Amino acid sequence: SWTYTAASASITAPAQLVGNVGELQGAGSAVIWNVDVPVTGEYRINLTWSSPYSSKVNTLVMDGTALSYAFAEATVPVTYVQTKTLSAGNHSFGVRVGSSDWGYMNVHSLKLELLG
Numbered sequence: 001s002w003t004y005t006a007a008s009a010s011i012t013a014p015a016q017l018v019g020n021v022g023e024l025q026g027a028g029s030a031v032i033w034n035v036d037v038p039v040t041g042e043y044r045i046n047l048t049w050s051s052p053y054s055s056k057v058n059t060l061v062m063d064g065t066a067l068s069y070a071f072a073e074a075t076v077p078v079t080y081v082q083t084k085t086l087s088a089g090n091h092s093f094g095v096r097v098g099s100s101d102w103g104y105m106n107v108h109s110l111k112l113e114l115l116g
Helices: none
Strands: 002-005 010-012 030-035 041-049 055-062 065-072 078-086 091-096 106-114
Touching: 030 106, 041 055, 055 078, 065 078, 091 106
Parallel strands: none
Antiparallel strands: 002 106, 010 030, 030 091, 041 078, 041 106, 055 065, 055 091
């Protein structure tokens, strides 16, 4: 498990990197993380965010996949666990918000744990 600092990612407006925390604000934002998969194994996607509201409609960008999900009422460093089999080579990670999946939260860091 590693904490992929959002500052090393691409803070696309309305996204804004503040204090090493990429916080998106409404559709159009995209906190894209650029990293290279270490080995060939199942890495479960854990997204750390804090948006004290109720439920938003965002699209999480991981391993080049557009996994749509509603940001469950969160506030405390909550790690959205999503099991995705990662392969060796190169993979794209991040968080995108758009008309199809709008949001308004803070993107602390893209955590990647070694599931299997």
